[PDB]
Amino acid sequence: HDEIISELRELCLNYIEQDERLSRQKLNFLGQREPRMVLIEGLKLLSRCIEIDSADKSGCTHNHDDKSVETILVESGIVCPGLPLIIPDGYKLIDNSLILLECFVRSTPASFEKKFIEATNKLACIREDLAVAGVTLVPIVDGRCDYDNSFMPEWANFKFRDLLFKLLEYSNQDEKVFEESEYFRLCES
Amino acid sequence: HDEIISELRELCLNYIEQDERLSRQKLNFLGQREPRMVLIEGLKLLSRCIEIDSADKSGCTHNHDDKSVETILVESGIVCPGLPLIIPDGYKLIDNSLILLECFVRSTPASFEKKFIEATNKLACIREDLAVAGVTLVPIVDGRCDYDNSFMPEWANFKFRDLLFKLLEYSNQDEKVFEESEYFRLCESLKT
Ligand SMILES: [Cl-]
Ligand code: NA
C-alpha cells in the first residue's frame, strides 16, 4: 500500500501539468497518508483536472472555491431571491449574461444521455428566476466519455486510475471484513 | 541525505501555513529528489514566505508572476513610455498612487544598510517618470535581519534551516568527491 501511495505521489508531481488552479488539490492529495484519504483526494484531483479542462474549453472561469450561483451574482452586485443551491463547475458573468457550466463523465451512452438531461434540467430550473433579476442564463452542459484531460498524458491518467483502484480494493477488503459487523450488531439486539 | 529530504518534506507539508500563494513553490520543492535541487528550491520556498509576508505587512499585493512596473500600470490602463525593467516584490495601485515594495534579508548591519540604499535608489529612479504620467510613487523598502515570517512557526523555520544546512554540507562534499573524478576534468576542460 505504501508503494502505491508513493507511485501516485510521483505521477502527481511529475506527470500532472503545473497549472496554478491544480496546486491546492495536488497539495491536499500529497498531504494524505491514509489509503482511503489518498483515494478520495486522488478522485477529487482527477475530477479537478476534468472540470478545469471543461471550463477552458467552454470559455469560462473554473469554480475554484465552489461558490454557488447566488454567491457568484452577489459578488458582481446582483440581488437574487429564493434560488436553489447550484454550484457550477464553471461560470462567467459577461454584461447581462451568466454562463454556467456543468460537466460530467459517463462510460455508457444510456448513462451519458440520462446525465445530460439531468444536468440540462438542473441549470434550466433557475432560468426564469435569473431573468427577473435582469440576468440571461447561458447554460452549458459538457458531457465527456472518458476521464482524459490536457493536464495529464493518457498513460499517466490510466496508471493514476489503476493505482487508485488497487488502493480501493485494499479499502473494500475492510468493508468485506464486516462479517464481524453482523456479530457486534447482534451483540446489541 | 534521503532522511533529511524526508524531514524537510514533512515540515513543508505540516508546518508551512496553507496559503495558496505558497502552493506552487511548495510543489516545486516537494518534487525535487536531488540534494542540490532540494536545497535551491528550499531556499526559494523560504524566500517566497518572506516576500509574501512582506507584501501582507506592507498592505499590498505580492508580485506572484514577477510582472514589471510597466506591465503593472498597463493592466490598470496607464500608459508609460521610458521605464527601466523593475520587478517589485509587491505592488498596489490605489487611486493615483503606486505602492512598490522591495524586501530583503541581510545578516550583517554593513550588508543591511548597503542593500537598503540599493533598493531605495532602485525604486527612486522611476519617481519622475511615473509622475510625468500622473502616478505618485509610494516606494517601500522592507529590510529584515532574519528569516522570520508568519507562515512558519519559529521552531519549524529554525529546523527547516538546520536541515537545509545539513543538506548543503552533504551536497558540497559530493561536489568534492565529484571534483576528484575524471568527468570533472572533462567538465573543467569544457571551453569551447
Ligand atoms: Cl535580495
Ligand atoms: Na531582493
Give yes or no for a contact between B170 and B130, defined as CB atoms under 8 angstroms apart.
no
DSSP codes, A133-187: TT-EEEEEEEEESSS--TTS-HHHHHHHHHHHHHHHHHHHHHHHSTTHHHHHHHT
| Three-state SS at B150 | coil
Cα(B144) to ligand 2 centroid in Å equals: 11
Determine how many CB atoms are found less than 10 A away from the CB of residue B61.
18
Beta bridge partners of A81: none
Nearest to B135 by CA among B103, B102, B89, B92: B92
CA distances from B99 to A37, A130, B47, B90, B149 (A): 44, 40, 21, 8, 21
Residues 6+ apart with CB under 8 A from B126: B69, B83, B84, B86, B137
Which of A13, A14, A24 is the closest to B23 by Cβ? A24
Q: Which CATH architecture has domain A61-145?
A: 2-Layer Sandwich (3.30)
Chain B residues inside the 8 Å CB shell of A27: 13, 18, 23, 26-27
All residues with CB under 5 Å from ion ligand 2: B 104
Search chain B and give the residue with CA nearest A26. Answer: B27
Q: Is B66 one of the annotated binding-site residues? A: no
Q: For B144, list phi and psi in degrees, rounded to 5.
A: -125, 150
- The reported resolution of this PDB entry, expressed in Å, is 2.5
C-alpha to C-alpha distance for B172 and B163, rounded to whole angstroms: 14
From CA A169, how far away is CA A49, in angstroms rounded? 24
Active site residue A115: yes
Q: DSSP characters for B26-63?
A: HHHHHH--SHHHHHHHHHHHHHHHHHHHHHHHTTSEE-
Instruction: Report whether A83 contacts A129 (CB < 8 A).
Output: yes
Q: What is the DSSP string of chain A?
A: -HHHHHHHHHHHHHHS---GGGHHHHHHHHH--SHHHHHHHHHHHHHHHHHHHHHHHTTSEE-TT---HHHHHHHTT----S------SEEEEETTEEEEEEEEE-SSHHHHHHHHHHHHHHHHTTHHHHHHTT-EEEEEEEEESSS--TTS-HHHHHHHHHHHHHHHHHHHHHHHSTTHHHHHHHTT-
- Which residue from A14, A12, A54 is spatially nearest to A149, judged by alpha carbons? A54
Closest to B29 in 3D by CA, of B53, B52, B46? B46
Q: How far is CA B163 from CA B1, B2, B14, B17, B18, in A?
A: 10, 11, 15, 19, 21
Q: Could you give the 3-state DSSP secondary structure of residue B114?
A: helix
Of A14, A24, A31, the CB nearest to B31: A14
Task: Test B13 with A27 for CB contact under 8 angstroms.
Answer: yes
Residues of chain B with CATH 3.30.70.2640: 61-145
What residues in B contact A17, CB-CB < 8 Å? none
What residue in A sits closest to B64 (Cα-Cα)? A20
Residue of A nearest to B17 (CA): A27
Query: Which structural technique was applied?
Result: X-ray
Owner of C-alpha cell 519617481: B127
Task: List phi, psi (to 5°) of B101.
Answer: -110, 135
